[PDB]
């Protein structure tokens, strides 16, 4: 069935129409960004604000003795 | 007679024993200590190499 898979089609032609439009808050309106900023900030919370985009450096350290 | 002979017999070996024990003790405990003092320091060390590999990898 391809009235069915016309509609798999029909959405998939807007797989391509939107995907080759752009997609995001695009073909779609601002809405996405207005969350997006906050939701990706939550990801910043999900890692802590330890910059998930700077290569980390590492501890050089000593425990105690006498 | 017999009293004084046993008094001497006790005292002579006594002196042996207690000194030979005093020598042996300090040798052993220190040569043991020599290495304990290692072990303390160095344990710390292996830990931090172990830890580094985890720490960076996280």
UniProtKB/Swiss-Prot annotation, chain A:
Residues bearing the modification N6-acetyllysine: 6, 11, 44, 49, 64
Modified residues (N6-succinyllysine): 49, 64
GO cellular component, one term: proton-transporting ATP synthase complex
Record bears the keyword Zinc-finger: no
Broad class of where this protein is predominantly found: mitochondrion
Any one Gene Ontology BP term: proton motive force-driven ATP synthesis
GO molecular function terms noted in the UniProt entry: proton transmembrane transporter activity
Keyword Nucleotide-binding: no
Keywords: Acetylation, CF(0), Hydrogen ion transport, Ion transport, Membrane, Mitochondrion, Mitochondrion inner membrane, Phosphoprotein, Transit peptide, Transport
Subcellular location: Mitochondrion; Mitochondrion inner membrane
Known partners and oligomeric status: Component of the ATP synthase complex composed at least of ATP5F1A/subunit alpha, ATP5F1B/subunit beta, ATP5MC1/subunit c (homooctomer), MT-ATP6/subunit a, MT-ATP8/subunit 8, ATP5ME/subunit e, ATP5MF/subunit f, ATP5MG/subunit g, ATP5MK/subunit k, ATP5MJ/subunit j, ATP5F1C/subunit gamma, ATP5F1D/subunit delta, ATP5F1E/subunit epsilon, ATP5PF/subunit F6, ATP5PB/subunit b, ATP5PD/subunit d, ATP5PO/subunit OSCP.
Purpose of the protein: Subunit F6, of the mitochondrial membrane ATP synthase complex (F(1)F(0) ATP synthase or Complex V) that produces ATP from ADP in the presence of a proton gradient across the membrane which is generated by electron transport complexes of the respiratory chain. ATP synthase complex consist of a soluble F(1) head domain - the catalytic core - and a membrane F(1) domain - the membrane proton channel. These two domains are linked by a central stalk rotating inside the F(1) region and a stationary peripheral stalk.
Family: Belongs to the eukaryotic ATPase subunit F6 family.
Protein's name in the database: ATP synthase peripheral stalk subunit F6, mitochondrial
Source organism: Bos taurus
Name of the gene this protein is made from: ATP5PF
UniProtKB/Swiss-Prot annotation, chain B:
Coiled coil region boundaries: none
Cellular localisation: Mitochondrion; Mitochondrion inner membrane
Disulfides per UniProt: none
Modified sites of kind N6-acetyllysine: 6, 21, 29
Top-level lineage group: Eukaryota
Family that this chain belongs to: Belongs to the eukaryotic ATPase B chain family.
Complex formation: Component of the ATP synthase complex composed at least of ATP5F1A/subunit alpha, ATP5F1B/subunit beta, ATP5MC1/subunit c (homooctomer), MT-ATP6/subunit a, MT-ATP8/subunit 8, ATP5ME/subunit e, ATP5MF/subunit f, ATP5MG/subunit g, ATP5MK/subunit k, ATP5MJ/subunit j, ATP5F1C/subunit gamma, ATP5F1D/subunit delta, ATP5F1E/subunit epsilon, ATP5PF/subunit F6, ATP5PB/subunit b, ATP5PD/subunit d, ATP5PO/subunit OSCP.
Stated role: Subunit b, of the mitochondrial membrane ATP synthase complex (F(1)F(0) ATP synthase or Complex V) that produces ATP from ADP in the presence of a proton gradient across the membrane which is generated by electron transport complexes of the respiratory chain. ATP synthase complex consist of a soluble F(1) head domain - the catalytic core - and a membrane F(1) domain - the membrane proton channel. These two domains are linked by a central stalk rotating inside the F(1) region and a stationary peripheral stalk.
Protein name: ATP synthase peripheral stalk subunit b, mitochondrial
